Design a binder for this molecule. Structure first.
Ligand SMILES: NC(=O)c1ccc[n+]([C@@H]2O[C@H](COP(=O)([O-])OP(=O)(O)OC[C@H]3O[C@@H](n4cnc5c(N)ncnc54)[C@H](OP(=O)(O)O)[C@@H]3O)[C@@H](O)[C@H]2O)c1
Ligand SMILES: O=C(N1CCOCC1)N1CCN(c2ccc(Cl)cc2)CC1
Length: 306
């Protein structure tokens, strides 16, 4: 299934998460993205930060080349890293990601984060100027659609109320799972025809660089475990399926062949209303990404949200 974005284009509601840390070789990003497409994933999420666009773009091109999919059947996202918020740096950053991926266009380009950094050392940029330059990339045909990531409600409103806005963001990609379900923001987005896309929807990869290993492991949650057994699925599948029934597009990273195939099972069953309330009962404001390196930053998004 696919959801119609607010600029007319379509986005598959299940997305492949492509991040893997440095300890993993760049060549597994190629292998696993091919397997993902083979299992039925049509939405692939990447970014400049992830240092894998060559591999991921080659995986897409390899599956166009063997006739398994057509380019228009694939929805590929890249993101504008935070060192490149100044407007004159926006289009070059995008032309860069395209050259790396060896594609003619991304389906989606995002501002990766509102926390601007110098081209831990901070920058001040007017994000409306960055956005105008995002609009120009849509007009040029470089990005079929454009959107934001890690924006809170006030930071989104700044764009939507901009004088002479040409394009609403089509989406906001934010951390979103049963421990941090972003309900209030979700309602805001729905009221504006903006799609919430969930990352770390399986509880994040627990990278010691950003995540407190003392954090509860979402996929070992007792209520999700009980629901997995009721339905004879896995706690991963309950957490993904939770997101689809709330109108959220969900990403899922996995570099394991069995779990990549398992995750597409999310289309094969449904949770009931009481199942959904039980999962709603788990919200506890736990953002796994919780670092000094973001938290003292003038435009920290989790600064609002009280
Ligand atoms: N915009 C941003 O700021 C931002 C931030 C975070 C993530 N993202 C994007 O969203 C994507 C996904 O988020 P994430 O990387 O934090 O990981 P995630 O989807 O939350 O996955 C976390 C771990 O779950 C595992 N997993 C996958 N399927 C499973 C299953 N069926 N059963 C048990 N575990 C399973 C994976 O381990 P294995 O690989 O061993 O299977 C993965 O490392 C990222 O890859 C990236 O594309 C964006
Ligand atoms: O996409 C990112 N990945 C990919 C998922 O695994 C590691 C880091 N990052 C690092 C964490 N990032 C972040 C930025 C703002 C907030 Cl509020 C939370 C996390 C920026 C993007």
């Amino acid at each position: 299934q696919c959801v119609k974005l607010n600029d007319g284009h379509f986005m598959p509601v299940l997305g492949f998460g492509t991040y893997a840390p440095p300890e993993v070789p760049r060549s597994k990003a190629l292998e696993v993205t091919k397997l993902a497409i083979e299992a039925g994933f049509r939405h692939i999420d990447s970014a400049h930060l992830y240092n894998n666009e060559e591999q991921v773009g080659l995986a897409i091109r390899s599956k166009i080349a063997d006739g398994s999919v057509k380019r228009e059947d694939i929805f590929y996202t890249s993101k504008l890293w935070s060192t490149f918020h100044r407007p004159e740096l926006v289009r070059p950053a995008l032309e860069n990601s395209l050259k790396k991926a060896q594609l003619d266009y991304v389906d989606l380009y995002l501002i990766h984060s509102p926390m601007s950094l110098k081209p831990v050392i901070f920058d001040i940029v007017d994000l409306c100027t960055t956005w105008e330059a995002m609009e120009k990339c849509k007009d040029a045909g470089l990005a079929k659609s454009i959107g934001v990531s890690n924006f809170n409600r006030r930071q989104l409103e700044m764009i939507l109320n901009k004088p002479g806005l040409k394009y609403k963001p089509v989406c906001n990609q934010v951390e979103c799972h049963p421990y941090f379900n972003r309900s209030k923001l979700l309602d805001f987005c729905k009221s504006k025809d903006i799609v919430l896309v969930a990352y770390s929807a399986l509880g994040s990869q627990r990278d010691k660089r950003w995540v407190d290993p003392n954090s509860p492991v979402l996929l070992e949650d007792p209520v999700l475990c009980a629901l997995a057994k009721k339905h004879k699925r896995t706690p991963a599948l309950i957490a993904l399926r939770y997101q689809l029934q709330r109108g959220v597009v969900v990403l899922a990273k996995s570099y394991n062949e069995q779990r990549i195939r398992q995750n597409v099972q999310v289309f094969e069953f449904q949770l009931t209303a009481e199942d959904m309330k039980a999962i709603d009962g788990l919200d506890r404001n736990l953002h796994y990404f919780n670092s000094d390196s973001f938290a003292s930053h003038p435009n920290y998004p989790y600064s609002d949200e009280y």
